[PDB]
Amino acid sequence: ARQVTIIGAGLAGTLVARLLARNGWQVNLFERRPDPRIETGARGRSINLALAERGAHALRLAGLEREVLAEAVMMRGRMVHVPGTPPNLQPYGRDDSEVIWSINRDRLNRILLDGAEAAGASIHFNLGLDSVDFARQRLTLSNVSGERLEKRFHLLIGADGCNSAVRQAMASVVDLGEHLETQPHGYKELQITPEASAQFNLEPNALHIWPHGDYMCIALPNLDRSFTVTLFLHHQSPAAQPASPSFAQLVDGHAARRFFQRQFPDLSPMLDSLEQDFEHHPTGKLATLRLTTWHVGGQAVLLGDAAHPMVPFHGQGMNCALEDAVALAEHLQSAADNASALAAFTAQRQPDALAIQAMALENYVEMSSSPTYLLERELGQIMAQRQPTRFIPRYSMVTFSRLPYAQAMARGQIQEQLLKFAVANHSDLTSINLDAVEHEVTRCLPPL
Ligand SMILES: Cc1cc2nc3c(=O)[nH]c(=O)nc-3n(C[C@H](O)[C@H](O)[C@H](O)COP(=O)(O)OP(=O)(O)OC[C@H]3O[C@@H](n4cnc5c(N)ncnc54)[C@H](O)[C@@H]3O)c2cc1C
Ligand SMILES: CCOc1cc2oc(=O)n(CCC(=O)O)c2cc1Cl
Ligand SMILES: CCOc1cc2oc(=O)n(CCC(=O)O)c2cc1Cl
Ligand SMILES: CCOc1cc2oc(=O)n(CCC(=O)O)c2cc1Cl
Numbered sequence: 001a002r003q004v005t006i007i008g009a010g011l012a013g014t015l016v017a018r019l020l021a022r023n024g025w026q027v028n029l030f031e032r033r034p035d036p037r038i039e040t041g042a043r044g045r046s047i048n049l050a051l052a053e054r055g056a057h058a059l060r061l062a063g064l065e066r067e068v069l070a071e072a073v074m075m076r077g078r079m080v081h082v083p084g085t086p087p088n089l090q091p092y093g094r095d096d097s098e099v100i101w102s103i104n105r106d107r108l109n110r111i112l113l114d115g116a117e118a119a120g121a122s123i124h125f126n127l128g129l130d131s132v133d134f135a136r137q138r139l140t141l142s143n144v145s146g147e148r149l150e151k152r153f154h155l156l157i158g159a160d161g162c163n164s165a166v167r168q169a170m171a172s173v174v175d176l177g178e179h180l181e182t183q184p185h186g187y188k189e190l191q192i193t194p195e196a197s198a199q200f201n202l203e204p205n206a207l208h209i210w211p212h213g214d215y216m217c218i219a220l221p222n223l224d225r226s227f228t229v230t231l232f233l234h235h236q237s238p239a240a241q242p243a244s245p246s247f248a249q250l251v252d253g254h255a256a257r258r259f260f261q262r263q264f265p266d267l268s269p270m271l272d273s274l275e276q277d278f279e280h281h282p283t284g285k286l287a288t289l290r291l292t293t294w295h296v297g298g299q300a301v302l303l304g305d306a307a308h309p310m311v312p313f314h315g316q317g318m319n320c321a322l323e324d325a326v327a328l329a330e331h332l333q334s335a336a337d338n339a340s341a342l343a344a345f346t347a348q349r350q351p352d353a354l355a356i357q358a359m360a361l362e363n364y365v366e367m368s369s370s371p372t373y374l375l376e377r378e379l380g381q382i383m384a385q386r387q388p389t390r391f392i393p394r395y396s397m398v399t400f401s402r403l404p405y406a407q408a409m410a411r412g413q414i415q416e417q418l419l420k421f422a423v424a425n426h427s428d429l430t431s432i433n434l435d436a437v438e439h440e441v442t443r444c445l446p447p448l
């Protein structure tokens with residue numbers, strides 16, 4: 001039986017642990033945190049993620065989709081909130097088969113842990129990887145107190161997140177060609193209780209957006225009708241705009257309240273614990289990190305956030321990590337040896353990770369910033385109706401299909417260009433020749 005050591009019992013790590021263990025690999029999974037399935041008296045908080053077709057299909061292959069969806073809230077569309085006008089629902093797809101799912105991250109992680117164990121993987125909690133000795137094939141782990149434990153390894157999988165200790169250890173034996181692109185927005189999580197969301201008629205089956213240009217709020221629903229609100233706002237005000245809003249300007253919860261009352265007036269009354277949430281929840285950091293190399297021979301490989309940290313504006317990080325887990329398990333199971341498997345996995349996934357990193361950055365402007373956008377979406381829906389095998393909106397290709405991200409981006413660019421060309425030199429949708437637009441669709445978009 002082939003052996004594997006996995007670092008990080010997160011989303012990618014647990015899924016790959018289940019896929020390999022059920023194929024008869026001897027799997028040992030090391031996690032820095034305590035086991036979340038061990039109930040304590042700690043007062044934790046609900047953070048949700050949007051599960052889309054790539055993540056759902058990965059869970060489906062693993063036999064866990066039904067269990068995960070049983071506690072997921074359907075999000076049919078984008079509910080855009082602008083003060084003065086009623087909230088506008090922009091459906092994501094053609095029917096209720098084309099939806100995204102709001103899932104509690106802790107619940108998903110617990111289902112995945114149970115799944116990896118049921119398949120035969122051994123999970124070891126309260127052990128954080130500190131260092132790897134590649135030449136001696138040993139690694140060093142420790143608990144929070146720094147008590148060390150050394151282990152031998154044969155194959156090392158770094159599924160240890162955006163601040164990966166496996167990636168740090170690899171970067172010492174090989175130049176990973178790491179390129180970091182910091183993102184100016186920080187993020188803060190705030191809560192809407194079930195009573196408040198019901199009082200203010202906040203739609204549970206939608207992903208909510210309060211656009212505001214350089215900053216915005218989003219809200220994802222929970223099963224109990226509470227919502228997690230995420231504020232995206234610059235850490236610091238730029239030199240050109242010193243008066244522009246930023247986290248640096250919000251000294252306390254009371255300052256955050258004044259900011260919401262002024263900039264998000266329809267949202268502030270729903271946030272009862274705004275002051276406390278603001279002061280007690282830390283401001284998170286965002287970034288895009290691109291690596292030239294994801295593996296060291298046949299000894300170690302990275303996947304998920306460990307391999308490709310991305311900005312969260314497409315809700316695709318977990319979806320991409322679960323898709324990586326499937327690809328990695330497939331390559332490892334069927335290759336001639338581990339070195340061939342790692343080289344083939346990296347060659348396959350690197351162009352796709354780059355495409356989703358680029359599309360995630362582009363989706364920020366789409367969410368936070370229009371009459372022309374709605375006219376291009378209008379013409380795009382007509383083109384999707386006339387040619388459903390050639391014209392598939394980029395959001396639908398990313399979210400509802402398993403088309404490689406790089407192909408979704410490439411086809412998306414052709415579509416963006418033709419929509420922009422047709423909506424140019426025309427005031428209304430009635431002056432645009434639809435048959436002419438349909439002709440460049442047939443000329444430049446091959447069918448799928
Ligand atoms: C604000 C925000 C919103 C998001 N929303 C979405 C969304 O809607 N949809 C979506 O698809 N994605 C979303 N994402 C992205 C998603 O959360 C991640 O891409 C995903 O969790 C990556 O899974 P992972 O398994 O690679 O890493 P993680 O889930 O981060 O798991 C890594 C694991 O490794 C452990 N670990 C870390 N260091 C060590 C160590 N040294 N030793 C041992 N264990 C270690 C951690 O404790 C953790 O359990 C969001 C991210 C953010 C920040
Ligand atoms: C067995 C591993 O379990 C987990 C790993 C995790 O990694 C994370 O970033 N979070 C989410 C953020 C946080 O709740 O602090 C998280 C939660 C769980 Cl249950
Ligand atoms: C904290 C959760 O954050 C997110 C989740 C998400 O899921 C998605 O599908 N998107 C895009 C939605 C759209 O463009 O309407 C998305 C964006 C963000 Cl910031
Ligand atoms: C990317 C290229 O896109 C196009 C090329 C085009 O050439 C044309 O003659 N038409 C129609 C002219 C018009 O009625 O505006 C046309 C339309 C589109 Cl979308």
Ligand SMILES: [Cl-]
Pocket residue numbers: 310311312313314315316317318
């Ligand atoms: Cl994301």
